[PDB]
């Protein structure tokens, strides 16, 4: 129980993050309710720079606390994540106009962070946070560069592979902002269909799940793929399936954008900036979700 917790009133455990426990806490002096995440000199420098990466669709990093050889991150608090909202919305699904709003906003957050040379690398429904005003925000940007993405959390929970880009799974050392577009495409598909697109339960099952839907990649669609560290010539050769079968009832505008977000070649994959200009967003609005808190 470090002395700095004296700065807070209610310090209640609300969840189990990738790196440590997550608390809800109130600052006694300011009265602000925050998320306190419990988590090495390069990491300190990397994480401190994120205090100046502010955008409406990024969960704000308020403070870094290093004390008693322990590290704590103070973030802005939001009441719900997209995973719990997706579960809550399962009988009738999230309305298309709200999916569209959510995707548009998340692309804005990506476009901002990518323009500043920051990656997420571990996007997933549980780190997309929503509020009652129709906003959505990405949580934990930049943390992967600072402290890695482990196989198992501090609690031994399996870190999900479902949203992981194929270049990561094939051993690319120097993957970049396209990995976040891939993850967001997978999330888009899940919002539309109400089921995970590629729910792999090991690295090879993840890769084979992708291959069975999008086709086994080859040098025609992905120049250089056969020379990637973890590519094997013995991978089965699956034909690619129509998105009309993959994400019904999404319209041609949404299927076109999704196909561009899920291109194998990371240089071909659409950027966040270019995705914002896609015809799918011509009629975007900002609806208010029904939240029960
Ligand atoms: N290409 C990359 C990206 C991150 Br984040 C960490 C390591 N390598």
Give the experimental resolution in Å.
1.2
Q: Calculate helix-pair angle for 252-261, 178-193, nearest 10 degrees.
A: 140
Which residue's CA is the nearest one to ligand 1's atom 1? 174
User: What would you report as the CA-atom Rg of the chain, rounded to the nearest whole angstrom?
Assistant: 20
| DSSP code per residue over 17-59 | -SSSEEEEEEETTT--EEEEEE--HHHHHHHHHGGG---TTB-
Residue-wise burial string across 178-195, b where 16 or more C-beta atoms lie within 10 A, e elsewhere? bbbbbbbbbbbbbbbeee
Is 242 known to be catalytic? no
Longest alpha-carbon distance in the chain: 62
SS3 content of the chain, % helix, strand, coil (to 5): 35, 15, 45
**Catalytic pick among 87, 122, 201, 205:** 122
Count of CB atoms within 10 A of residue 34's CB? 20
Asked if residue 17 belongs to a known ligand binding site, the reply is yes
Asked if residue 76 belongs to a known ligand binding site, the reply is yes
Name the pairing type of β-strands 128-130 and 33-38: unpaired
Question: Ligand 1: which of 173, 175, 177 to mutate, judged by most atoms within 8 Å of the beta carbon?
Answer: 175
| DSSP code per residue over 50-93 | GGG---TTB--EEEEEEETTEEEEEEE--SEEHHHHHHHTTTT-
- Residue 205 phi/psi, 5-degree rounding, is -70, -40
Q: Indicate the DSSP class of residue 287.
A: P
**Residues followed by a break in the chain, C–N over 2.5 Å?**
39
Output the CA 10–ligand 1 centroid distance in Å. 36
Output the CA 170–ligand 1 centroid distance in Å. 14
Output the CA 103–ligand 1 centroid distance in Å. 24
| DSSP code per residue over 170-207 | TT-SS--THHHHHHHHHHHHHHHHSS-S---SSHHHHH
* Domains along the chain with CATH numbers: 5-79 (3.30.200.20), 80-290 (1.10.510.10)
Nearest-atom number in ligand 1 for the CA of 121 is 5
């Amino acid at each position: 129980s470090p002395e700095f917790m004296e700065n807070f009133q209610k310090v209640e455990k609300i969840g189990e993050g990738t790196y440590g426990v997550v608390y809800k806490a109130r600052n006694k002096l300011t009265g602000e309710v925050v998320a306190l995440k419990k988590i090495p000199s390069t990491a300190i420098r990397e994480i401190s720079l994120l205090k100046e990466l502010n955008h409406p669709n990024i969960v704000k990093l308020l403070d870094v606390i290093h004390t008693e050889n322990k590290l704590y991150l103070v973030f802005e608090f939001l009441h719900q994540d997209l995973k719990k909202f997706m579960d809550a919305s399962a009988l009738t699904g999230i309305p298309l106009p709200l999916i569209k709003s959510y995707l548009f906003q998340l692309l804005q957050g990506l476009a901002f962070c990518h323009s500043h040379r920051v990656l997420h690398r571990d996007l997933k429904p549980q780190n997309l946070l929503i509020n009652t005003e129709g906003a959505i925000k990405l949580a934990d940007f930049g943390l992967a560069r600072a402290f890695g993405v482990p196989v198992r959390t501090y609690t031994h929970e399996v870190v999900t592979l479902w949203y992981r880009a194929p270049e990561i799974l094939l051993g690319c050392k120097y993957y970049s902002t396209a990995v976040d577009i891939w993850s967001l495409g997978c999330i888009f598909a899940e919002m539309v269909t109400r089921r995970a697109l590629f729910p792999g339960d090991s690295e090879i099952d993840q890769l084979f799940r992708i291959f069975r839907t999008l086709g086994t990649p080859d040098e025609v669609v992905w120049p250089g793929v056969t020379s990637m560290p973890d590519y094997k010539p013995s991978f089965p050769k699956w034909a690619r399936q129509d998105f009309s079968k993959v994400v019904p009832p999404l319209d041609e505008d949404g299927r076109s954008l999704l196909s561009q977000m899920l291109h194998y070649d990371p240089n071909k994959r659409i950027s966040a900036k270019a995705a914002l200009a896609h015809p799918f967003f011509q009629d975007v609005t900002k609806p208010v979700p029904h939240l029960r808190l």
